Design a binder for these strands. Structure first.
Ligand SMILES: Nc1ccn([C@H]2CC[C@@H](COP(=O)(O)OP(=O)(O)OP(=O)(O)O)O2)c(=O)n1
Ligand SMILES: [Mg+2]
Ligand SMILES: [Mg+2]
Lengths: 983, 363, 357
DNA sequence: AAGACGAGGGCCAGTGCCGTAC
DNA sequence: GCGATACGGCACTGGCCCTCGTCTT
């Protein structure tokens, strides 16, 4: 009720828009495809009084919302644009706080630069960071320079107080702060860490550059290489995200000089004061260049991104807020402890193996070792120069008692010892590494004159290249090797020749111990090359490899390590345990710097909600604080968020060490976070782009009908329907599908599905070939399919027809290619044109995949922005405290309070409904299916995580530590209306 | 189960043949050799460092071996419990606070009528009821961490979570001997029962300031058998397939290793400026590093003999003084972990040893 | 008035009737306080250090407490005599050699009669009969000097000579209190009769090599008391002032640091820093910065002087600017000021400067 | 006695492979 | 014709350059 999926809506009375011919085509298509076995399972319709609409459509609704949200900031931006500039001061004031430079650059001591808008770039001495040290900010009126409290030499104690720069004005509109990577500067703002607030938003020239004239990483690689027929035309129309480069692009003036000494990151606080004036000058140059860049970008961005939803969305997407406490510090300590322990064990075992294998140097018995014969095995004993002389060999030159009368003979032997000691020093010069030990052992040791010297062979690894060959047995064979690739593995007769000969002089090789090792292995070039395992003699060549890259070292083959082949020796379960240890510390190894240095400001009891103090939590002399994620508003592509730490934050896995990082963001007492993850966005996006193209309805496609048919709760989604084939649930099937939409390469899908399902390649190939039915078919000498009914002809001039390309049957890649063909905007809907570097006008373009992905992911990001502005609209309109946003692409979580959580979740549901209805309206019809209108899962709890139930590794007991639980949602939240008076 | 000969030959234990696993696990052994009591000495010292010194609120306690009112003490927990009030006074009633003591305890054993003694290191941790379990898990992880280091294969040391007959939580620590796991340390949470029974009159002298309020202390307790632990490290030090070549050597941690370095005389014979060995000797012992003297000898044999002799004594390094070193000043050095000849300078050798041990204490 | 400042400063255990000198000299206790325990540990450490420098080689051992045949030990001789034949292998029968050990021996103290404990340090030196007396005199001098080094007065320690039909020559080290000179250490020259009683026969194992000569060794019995020695140095350190000037290398707690400025977290941070730094180099530091009130300075100094603390450190608010810290000596009571960075080196150099004989 | 070629080690950026998220 | 957008890590390496050594004038 009706039309195979719709709800009670007041978003337009008319309407059909029947398209009887089109729906006959669609029905016939879906019959021959064929799907005509409807389950007839109507989802429970919801009857609630919707929030007031402003008319006429929801388009003007979101437009007026986005405009009324971004109007003051646009005004401030315009104030920055028409700003007439007063020149830089002749000298910078060496005074704490802000210094205003107005007429002739006079120094006027100010606490807070009262301005509507300003550019900003903070400085911070990395030597003892991360506390601000300098800052410069220009305004449409005059100049400003802020100096930190680091003007007096003291023995400071840094617990990250409210020492960051003060920028906001007190009440008892309003603000806009622009800057290159403005999030970093925002992180150094005093009033941004407060639980409440804030009016001040931020605009990023880097993100804006990315929106206007951005380029992919693959482009960045060959862009900087400038130092594929028409692939170099966009080279001068775009640039990298660097400030100097983006200024050279948008301003095109003289090249701005950068600090040659890198004093802020390389030097101490001492050499900063010595060059204070110069550093201040450089900072001023930075804020000036950024000012210019902004001035030239704002109208360009306004042109390229005309819809205000993108603007306001980018405004709210830049003020993220992560509340934390002492549990953060405890987390750091415990995680680093566990990491150091596991690393200690691993390095202990490996250095043990490296110690007990060092003994077979005497005498020349290392050649017999089938693993250790490539390396050095050097024996050095240098050196000395003659000074003593002459002409005599220096190489050869039971009594019971109780005497003590020689009391001071000990000081005689002591004096002789010292006098002997002091004479040898001028014989050697510089202390070299231990020459007695072999070279492989020398390299595997820390230098003697190193401040971080540890005894024995350190620097063992995991993932080094010496140590795995040092101990491991090799796939039903004996030797591992490396050259262009390590020991081959994972990611009509064929024959090859053999050859053995002797010349010299080259390292001896042994091929018997290998065969004997194989004998011992089976005691329990050809043949045995395809499925079994063996090693030849010399060559070296492929002779039976599947992967085209190699893998040093086998670090994710636990199922191939815990099934016999392959194993290690000596010995036992040491191998799989070592792999386990590696897998445990894999995350924290490549992240610990980003989380340990992840700064955080603590707000004292003087500046926190007293209503939270009233709440029965303090907690026991506990410290409350927060950290702003420091997120670049728009990083390619499409204008997605970019953040070094939190966007690549691992999930709740009981295997990884720091896997609790996601769930360490704990809400303050009285507060709780409510969020949701769109399920699913890009899939339904491609679906809609298909059905809306084919006809009017949403279920008029072979692919688009299955997307809006499944429910995750006690049911089966499309991903889940592909995962139960079988099939692997569920993220893997997601990768397979989303990989299929953007290029289901036969060998890619092959080794992928084969990697995930773990079976034999033939049956797998059958599965792929069956699943390859979706992209089929497609289009002098050519592919045997054209617009003509048959390809065969004689002297038939048809160069005018070879201009159409389109797949057939199930999928709708034709529409994505249709958006990928237009030489102009290519923006659906909304609605923002990207990259002067990918716009096919004056581009070859050969960047197709990136642009299909651009289209769908753009729909995803505009979905994100729509969600942001929608959530913001009914959060200020109604009494829902806590408007702070924390978004991760698909997912988005707000920091609400315990008494306004269900209404906030209701706001999330309304938001999702309105956004889906927007995507439906931009293509028609305004009508939308049932199992896609509302969210299925709304997370509501203290710390943010994935599933409502959460286990972890390091703390071992989650609720053991001061925690709570989560709640699935749901249908029970659809009883609390947006009005304050509920329950 | 054949390293015992290495323990007899090189006295880390008694030369008596009757040293069964039962006689070693009961404490009815005739005693330990000098190298053994030295190993246990460094082990107990390493305990005292990583339990008492670095952690504040922990003070040494001296419990007697008997009672004023014949059988001796079974555990040195109660003797430390008797010292609760004064130690409360020296901490200004600031709990959590602990009392630590390493003393030999006497256990009655019916051999299937005798009594066996064994050195035990005990810490009694007086902690508020609000945070009892937290401190229990704390000490669990930390003790287990302390025992899982110094080991060549830390996998052998395990922990077992167990409850009492009434319901009191507790944790045991095991070491995987070649014949199975064996108890080496125990951690229990005593719900202020014994303290209540010891002071029935005025319980006001038991109240400890938890912070904003004075509460009755819950008595955490950790007791570690250092004899079974010394034997555990003894077994762990010794080596196991397709190595193709084997040498008898036990790999003890450089921190707890009985004899650190071994000084000898090479080439040999050389008279009579050999008094420099005495210099290096006193210089070495002055820095607190163990040095074995290879002066008066009957061998006069293959170097492999005394090299293996030192490897059986877990000696870290073998410093060799020869007449060429008497000329220039560069003595020989053979490491234990990696049997390899290496040249070095004298004071450089001293500082190398000090830095070696000190850094071995670290990561 | 010394026994009372050992009760309030936790050198001895809490007692009200068994606090007398007679009950202290007796093994009966009221055990020991943390300060006394650390003092005994440092004393025993210096004891083991003053015999490890002794050439050629003396092996440490441990003896059982109860009876092997079913009782508690009185002396620390038998257990050392049981490990003689074994250590013979380790000395390779080459020369005279000794066995040192520190243990808690017992003795009956006299209603009913009880049992007292004492921690004694013994050294059993096996030496040829012809060179036993000379070595006994050697150990006499070395032990006397050992007591003399940490002594505030060498005249307080004395050495007496004696002899009998069972022991041909012996020496006993006394200590003047001066409420009465008391036994502190015994140095006897027992024959092989003690050893020939537990190994007959066939006594062919007992005789060690002595310059191509086989000879059953005479047994030197060193037996010192570390408890009586502890009390000795306690009475040796007692000097309106009431300050115990124990030896720097002997003092249990050698430094203590508090705060002066009103209770601030930063002060505790700095103090924890100095705490860790000083403990990193093996320097016992008393934490009085906890604190909680920091009432007075004079009574605090009195407390730290009754605990024999070498130096007291004060971390004011100026330290959070210039790094300067308020040092205060004990032997001179000079209120000094020095940078916090140069404190470790100063204390270490000061302790190392007390290393002389 | 001064000058020039040669060998060893630190600092640098570049590259290959692995690791996480959506 | 095709995984896509990021984000970092460590292991390895060829190259610039200072330092010490050593042969040469
Ligand atoms: N390997 C991936 C993972 C994700 N995405 C894109 C596609 C969708 C978008 C959001 O990611 P997910 O939420 O993980 O996909 P989903 O289908 O929405 O999953 P769910 O139904 O659980 O929300 O990111 C992608 O392109 N490639
Ligand atoms: Mg999703
Ligand atoms: Mg997602």
């Amino acid at each position: 009720m009706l039309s195979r999926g719709l709800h009670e809506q007041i978003f337009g009375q008319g309407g059909e828009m029947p398209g009887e011919a089109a729906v006959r085509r669609s029905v016939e298509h879906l019959q021959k495809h064929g799907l005509w076995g409807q389950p007839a399972v109507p989802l429970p319709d919801v009857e609630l009084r919707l929030p007031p609409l402003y008319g006429d459509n929801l388009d003007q609704h979101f437009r007026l919302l986005a405009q009324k949200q971004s109007l003051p900031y646009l005004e401030a931006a315009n104030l920055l644009l028409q700003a007439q500039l007063p020149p830089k001061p002749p000298a910078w004031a060496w005074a704490e706080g802000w210094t205003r430079y107005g007429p002739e650059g006079e120094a006027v001591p100010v606490a807070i630069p009262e301005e509507r808008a300003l550019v900003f770039a903070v400085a911070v001495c990395l030597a003892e960071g991360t506390c601000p040290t300098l800052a410069v900010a220009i305004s449409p009126s005059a100049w400003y320079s802020w100096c930190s409290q680091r003007l007096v030499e003291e023995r400071y104690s840094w617990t990250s107080q409210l020492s960051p720069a003060d920028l906001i004005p007190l009440e008892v509109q309003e603000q806009l702060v622009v800057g290159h990577n403005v999030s970093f500067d925002r992180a150094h703002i005093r009033e941004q860490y407060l639980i409440q607030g804030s009016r001040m938003r931020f605009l990023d020239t880097m993100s804006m550059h990315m929106a206007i004239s951005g380029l992919s990483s693959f482009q960045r690689s060959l862009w900087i290489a400038a130092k594929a027929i028409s692939s170099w035309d966009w080279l001068d129309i775009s640039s990298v995200n660097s400030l100097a480069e983006v200024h050279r692009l948008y301003v095109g003036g003289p090249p701005l000089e950068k600090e040659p000494r890198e004093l802020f990151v390389k030097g101490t606080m001492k050499d900063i004061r010595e060059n204070f004036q110069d550093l201040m000058q450089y900072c001023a140059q930075d804020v000036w260049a950024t000012h210019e860049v902004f001035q030239q970008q704002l109208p360009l961005f306004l042109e390229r991104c005309p819809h205000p939803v993108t603007l306001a969305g980018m405004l709210e997407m830049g003020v993220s807020y992560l509340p934390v406490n002492q549990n953060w510090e405890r987390y750091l300590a415990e995680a680093q402890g566990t990491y150091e322990e596991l690393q200690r064990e691993m390095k202990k075992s490996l250095m043990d193996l490296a110690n007990d294998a060092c003994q077979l140097l005497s005498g020349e018995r290392y050649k017999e070792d089938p693993w250790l014969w490539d390396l050095e095995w050097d024996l050095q004993e240098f050196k000395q120069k003659k000074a003593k002389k002459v002409k005599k060999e220096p190489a050869t030159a039971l009594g019971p008692c109780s005497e003590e009368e020689e009391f001071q003979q000990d000081v005689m032997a002591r004096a002789c010892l010292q006098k002997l000691k002091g004479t040898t020093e001028l014989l050697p010069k510089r202390p070299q590494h231990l020459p007695g030990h072999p070279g492989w052992y020398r390299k595997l040791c820390p230098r003697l004159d190193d401040p971080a010297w540890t005894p024995g062979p350190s620097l063992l690894s995991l993932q080094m290249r010496v140590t795995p060959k040092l101990m491991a047995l090799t796939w039903d064979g004996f030797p591992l090797h490396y050259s262009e690739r390590h020991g081959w593995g994972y990611l009509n007769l064929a024959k090859l020749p053999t050859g053995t000969t002797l010349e010299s002089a080259g390292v001896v090789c042994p091929y018997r111990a290998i065969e004997s090792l194989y004998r011992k292995h089976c005691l329990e070039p050809y043949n045995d090359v395809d499925i079994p395992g063996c090693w030849f003699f010399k060559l070296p060549h492929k002779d039976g490899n599947s992967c085209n890259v190699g893998s040093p070292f086998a670090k994710d083959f636990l199922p191939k390590m815990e099934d016999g082949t392959l194993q290690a020796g000596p010995g036992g379960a040491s191998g799989p345990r070592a792999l386990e240890i590696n897998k445990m510390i894999s995350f924290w190894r490549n992240a610990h710097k980003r989380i340990s240095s992840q700064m955080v400001v603590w707000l004292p009891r003087s500046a926190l909600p007293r209503a939270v103090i009233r709440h029965p939590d303090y907690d026991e002399e506990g410290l409350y604080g927060a950290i702003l994620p420091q997120v670049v508003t728009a990083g390619t592509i499409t204008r997605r968020a970019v953040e070094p730490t939190w966007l690549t934050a691992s999930n709740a896995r009981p295997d990884r060490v720091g896997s609790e990082l996601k769930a360490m963001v704990q809400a303050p007492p009285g507060y709780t976070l409510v969020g949701a993850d769109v399920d699913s966005q890009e899939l339904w996006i491609a679906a809609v782009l298909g059905d809306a193209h084919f006809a009017g309805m949403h279920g008029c496609t072979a692919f688009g009908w299955m997307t809006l048919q499944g429910r995750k709760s006690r049911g089966t989604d499309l991903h889940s329907k592909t995962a139960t084939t079988v099939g692997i649930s569920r993220e893997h099937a997601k990768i397979f599908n989303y990989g299929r939409i953007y290029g289901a390469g036969q060998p890619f899908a092959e080794r992928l599905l084969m990697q995930f399902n773990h079976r034999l390649t033939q049956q797998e190939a059958a599965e792929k070939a069956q699943q390859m039915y979706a992209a089929t078919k497609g289009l002098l000498r050519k592919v045997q399919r054209e617009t003509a009914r048959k390809s065969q002809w004689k002297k038939w001039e048809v160069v005018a027809e070879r201009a159409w390309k389109g797949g057939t049957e199930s999928e709708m890649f034709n529409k994505l290619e249709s958006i990928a063909t237009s030489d102009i905007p290519r923006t659906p809907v909304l609605g923002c044109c990207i990259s002067r570097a990918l716009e096919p006008s004056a581009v070859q373009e050969e960047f197709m995949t990136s642009r299909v992905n651009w289209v769908v992911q753009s729909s995803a990001v505009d979905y994100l922005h729509l969600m942001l502005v929608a959530m913001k609209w009914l959060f200020e309109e109604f009494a829902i405290d806590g408007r702070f946003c924390i978004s991760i692409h698909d997912e988005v979580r707000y920091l609400v309070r315990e008494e306004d959580r269900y209404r906030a979740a209701l706001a999330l549901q309304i938001t999702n409904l309105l956004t889906r209805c927007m995507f439906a309206y931009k293509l028609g019809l305004n009508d939308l299916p049932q199992s896609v209108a509302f969210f299925s899962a709304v997370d509501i709890d203290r710390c943010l995580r994935k599933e409502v139930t959460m286990d972890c590794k390091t703390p071992s007991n989650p609720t053991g530590m001061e925690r709570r639980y989560g709640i699935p949602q749901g249908e029970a939240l659809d009883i609390y209306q947006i009005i304050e008076l509920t329950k | 189960a054949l390293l015992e000969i290495c323990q007899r030959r090189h006295f880390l234990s008694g030369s008596k043949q009757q040293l069964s696993r039962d006689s070693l696990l009961s404490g009815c052994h005739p005693g330990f050799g000098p190298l053994g009591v030295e190993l246990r000495k460094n082990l107990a010292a390493e305990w005292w460092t990583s339990v008492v010194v670095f952690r504040e609120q922990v003070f040494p306690v001296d419990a007697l071996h008997h009672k004023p009112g014949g059988k001796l003490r079974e555990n040195l927990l109660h003797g430390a419990l008797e010292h609760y009030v004064n130690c409360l006074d020296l901490v200004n009633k600031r709990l959590p606070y602990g009392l630590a003591q390493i003393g030999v305890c006497f256990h009655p054993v019916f051999d299937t009528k005798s009594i066996g003694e064994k050195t035990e290191a005990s810490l009694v941790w007086f902690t508020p009821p609000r945070t009892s379990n937290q401190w229990l898990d704390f000490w669990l992880r930390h003790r287990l961490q302390w025992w899982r280091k110094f080991a060549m294969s830390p996998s052998n040391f395990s922990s077992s979570d167990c409850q009492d007959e009434e319901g009191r939580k507790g944790n045991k620590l095991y070491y995987n001997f070649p014949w199975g796991k064996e108890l080496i340390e125990t951690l229990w949470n005593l719900g202020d029962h014994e303290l209540l029974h010891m002071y029935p009159g005025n319980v006001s002298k038991l109240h400890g300031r938890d912070g904003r309020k004075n509460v009755v202390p819950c008595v955490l307790s950790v007791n570690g058998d250092l004899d079974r632990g010394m034997l555990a490290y003894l077994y762990d030090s010794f080596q196991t397939r397709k190595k193709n070549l084997h040498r008898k050597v036990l790999k003890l941690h450089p921190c707890l290793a009985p004899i650190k370095v071994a000084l000898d005389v090479g080439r040999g014979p050389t008279l009579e400026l050999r008094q420099v060995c005495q210099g290096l000797f006193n210089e070495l012992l002055e820095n607190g590093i163990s040095v074995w003297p290879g002066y008066l000898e009957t061998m006069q044999s293959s170097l492999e003999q005394l090299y293996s002799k030192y490897d059986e004594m877990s000696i870290l390094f073998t410093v060799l003084v020869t007449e060429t070193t008497l000329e220039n000043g560069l003595i020989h050095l053979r490491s234990r972990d990696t049997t390899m000849k290496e040249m070095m300078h004298i004071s450089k050798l001293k500082d190398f040893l000090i830095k070696y041990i000190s850094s071995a204490k670290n990561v």
